[PDB]
Symmetry: C5
Subunit: 270 residues, 5 copies
């Protein structure tokens, strides 16, 4: 960030690893939303709290570094690398748990399918969010938070980029995926990675391995610096929809994300 | 360009970064076109101004250089670029045509899409090519015309007579203008089109990705008149409305983060 | 959590082991029995013979303040019998209104293998917490025998070791990314109703099992742990229009070297 | 070719770049074929001249080389920047396409089976005969695989060396009966990709930042015999599906070439 | 593999290149099978000879090396590299040759589509085949060869891996693709490469170029050593099915494969 970055402290107990998971927040806590609803044209677009998928977020507490915050050089934890995994991909190989049945009702149940998003960020502070949504008029129930101008309104500009609509991902299960994307004009002290696929019946493609590592160092060899000795993890893994037999109703299906972050002590001015 | 390129000036205040965004121009300003129309066979192909998606374009003003013993020009070295609001499409409740015979959720944006951006030291060079030479574009849109005002059958293939400079936002339709590969020496452009009726869009986003703008000889776009030229075209697909079963083009904005350095040139 | 020393690097210091794991899709001859779907509000209690499981085996390897353990360095692995799917005459649901050939295997599929120095660590996660697995299958249970709603997401209480072939259902158990320090695992799932399988085969491909520090899986008790899950898709039978899981076998060729460790 | 290749001449005026385009030859000249026809079973397979897509080809004239009294020099094609022009033309759902969502939606963008292919060569591209239906009747002036006697037997559906030709005329050799001959083309570099299916979506990229090296395993590029550069193209993006008629038309796209050549010394 | 490999002989006439093609063997010789048939449930699965696609195979005769077979060091040809191409991909851009017509009969004919396999091997001996098939009970007409135990039977194990079912690809147009895969437990002296795609109407994707070369040398820099001065080529290129208009019957469509192999003389202990 806008800190002056100095030498990497090295030695034993200059590096630590944190293991964490984020369970999905698809509108309920057990990995499925309630049924997806669609207001009739000309009616209010006011979906149920429990059908709006949100970003998962957590701040992990790191070991205290500076006894005096007033020393003229500080130590901050620097996130160097992350091993991350989407847990329970194998759970989707299930054609018997009440899925809409293929081949005119004689086949097995539909495995999870439809539009999906997979996304994670590691950061030294809350992730910066830019407001952008499909329908400016959408009404999010409390306690969810959506793009608002200072006056409380939400005009047509919220369907494109208007800098007036910004927020910090500072609470789990609160910021809907559908009205908030990572702000590419900020997040200097965060690394984020996302992939969205659309379509009605699109098959999800997900891989898993313990052999994959992502470097979090930027073009200048600096990783996220954890302000207040706090590591900020964010997740969004909506694998697709579950299509229920007989009802033919659709439910968002979320998956949890494992994190394994490596950090090292780093010196900064002030 | 047709300038003689010399040494990279280095020192304090020899590099700068510019941040910009281009909002989409899909025919209106709030990211959706009006309904897509299709003339009956034998009728004029004359679509509405507000249903024709166009290239977004802007010229960013750079610091003045040769105010103050060699000639200097800004050289665009790299760009971090992002399509903003991809997450907006994970929305199955905002009036989309409903799946599984009307009992399921609304269709997320789908269909044919184009994603494209250019960084340049001058206006982007456009070659005329369109699906239907007879198409009638309402004013103020601009489409391929010969000098006499006509548009013959050759405009469906390559005819060098049909050329233009992308010199105005929301004006040049994506469907009749492509980047001219015979020119654009002083511009770097990147585009991907996918077709199909219900094709799912696939879009990624990260702040960890950089594109080098230097050519085979280590030279980036040189900003003539101290002006950086950005262009965008991000039509994510169509929105399919429930009940009407009408289709609307859906555009997305594009963030740019360009790094430039001072470069010396002879005339 | 061992202290790893020098690679012993002399005569009789390397060996290669060949093995195959046949699939465990619910029966032993590469097809499950018909996939069943309880009516809404009825118990989700599928047949033993319709639940695909992880294949697993422990290969026995050759038999002081410094010890020698076998270190798995590399693996050549292959999914055998991919060519078996080019078959449009063996009773498949027929295309083009019954006049065409039978459907080749299609639908949702998973391909997965692990090489390890100990049993593969499994985390419990399933689509439906209420699912009832017949004996002798094992599914996520708390210590008290219950299985609450948390088993649809990550709850650390639901863990197991892949210590028996044809026993742990693919659908309620994934590799635990919080453990498996001494195992290398690789998996790819594709969903969809009629999704075409895409599978490649060659004897020219090798996977390195060494980690970021050049250490491979260390075989505790002189035992190499292999695991497999290759559900190619479903077979769609003509007339019945019923679906059967189709499994494929996996060949392993592992190279190991002697490695020195403290204790 | 069967020349002995020597040193790369370097100096002033030892390299040049040529710009060219090939417009598509899908059966007419304005980027669409006439309607695709399908004979009834048992009837002759005799499609219209104007519904058979062909290879585009051109020979560009290079500067004359052996004229100075001071080794003999041929132009060597080193690299090519190539682009499919007018990909953006396909983002069009208003020009009479079969309409989606039961007639209330927009027109179908181009879709279906497609082929994208280009070659750079020092001589005409070598073609091997292979076709789906040996009995197909190509109208004059099109050329299809024939034995010396004029016949075309069942072997033309697989590889029979008897069926060979040189791509020596634009808009003449149908894509469907001629592929690049991998047993020849020593002095040509070719690159092709075909995708099938009824409604398959075309995926096409465009950029001015991409270069293809034309040098072989021995660092030799195509050597332009008679000071002539041979370009070939085949860009059938897919079909246009017309509303109401529900008839299909092949849609071709033009291909830009930017070739870099250098002088190269050869012995007889 | 199995020979003591010594120095690479170098000199004039120490390298040679062979050009060959394998025409497809989809059940007839002109690139199409007869109609695909499907026995009714409970009836014998006994398809026609001319509807079963098989591996193409050929042994190319190489120049004689050893005048005395009794010399204590021999020369064998070593296959170093291969340029290989699937010929006639462009043949599929054909919507007028009697294909089932799109858009309710008013459109053009279906181009070849459906499940496909592309595969080639270069070897110093016949390719090793492992028996595995979808239906153990399938009855292959003479002269085709399918997995049999020594006693003549074919039990349920032939649907998975049973080492008892092995064969050498020693005859063209004889070993069905559907019951035989390359044996990964053998083929030490062969290099093989295969890709299968399934589905009913799956579009084939095939590329062609004269600029692509595959190295055949193993992890120890040894290529296939041609026993008896014979190079073994194998091919399987079933591009998909042809769907005929009116009949709505399906025919396997095969394509030929070009080979260009480079070999060098190599010394071995004897
Ligand atoms: Cl609207
Ligand atoms: Cl079908
Ligand atoms: Cl469920
Ligand atoms: Cl895999
Ligand atoms: Cl069965
Ligand atoms: Cl016929
Ligand atoms: Cl290409
Ligand atoms: Cl290329
Ligand atoms: Cl037309
Ligand atoms: Cl030949
Ligand atoms: Cl035919
Ligand atoms: Cl291949
Ligand atoms: Cl036929």
């Amino acid at each position: 960030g806008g800190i002056e970055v100095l030498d990497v402290k090295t030695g034993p107990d200059s590096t630590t690893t944190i293991e964490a998971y984020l369970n999905p927040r698809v509108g309920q806590n057990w990995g499925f939303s309630t049924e997806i609803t669609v207001a009739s044209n000309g009616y209010n677009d006011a979906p149920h709290l429990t059908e709006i998928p949100c970003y998962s977020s957590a701040r992990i507490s790191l070991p205290l570094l500076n006894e005096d915050i007033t020393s003229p050089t500080l130590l901050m934890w620097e996130a160097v690398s992350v091993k991350t995994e989407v847990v329970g991909i194998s759970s989707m190989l299930n054609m018997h748990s009440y899925g809409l049945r293929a081949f005119g009702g004689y086949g097995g149940g539909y495995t999870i399918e439809g539009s999906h998003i997979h996304f994670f960020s590691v950061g030294g502070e809350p992730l910066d969010l830019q407001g952008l949504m499909q329908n400016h008029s959408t009404q999010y129930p409390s306690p969810l938070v959506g793009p608002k101008k200072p006056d409380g309104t939400t005009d047509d500009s919220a369907q494109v980029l208007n800098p007036i609509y910004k927020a910090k991902l500072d609470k789990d299960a609160t910021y809907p995926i559908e009205c908030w994307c990572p702000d590419p004009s900020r997040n200097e002290n965060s690394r984020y990675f996302g992939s969205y696929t659309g379509g009605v019946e699109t098959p999800p493609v997900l891989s898993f391995t313990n052999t994959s590592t992502t470097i979090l160092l930027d073009e200048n060899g600096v990783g996220p610096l954890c302000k207040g000795d706090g590591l900020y993890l964010s997740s969004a893994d909506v694998a697709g929809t579950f299509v229920q037999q007989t009802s033919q109703k659709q439910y968002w299906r979320g998956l949890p994300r494992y994190f394994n972050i490596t950090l090292r002590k780093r010196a900064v001015k002030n």
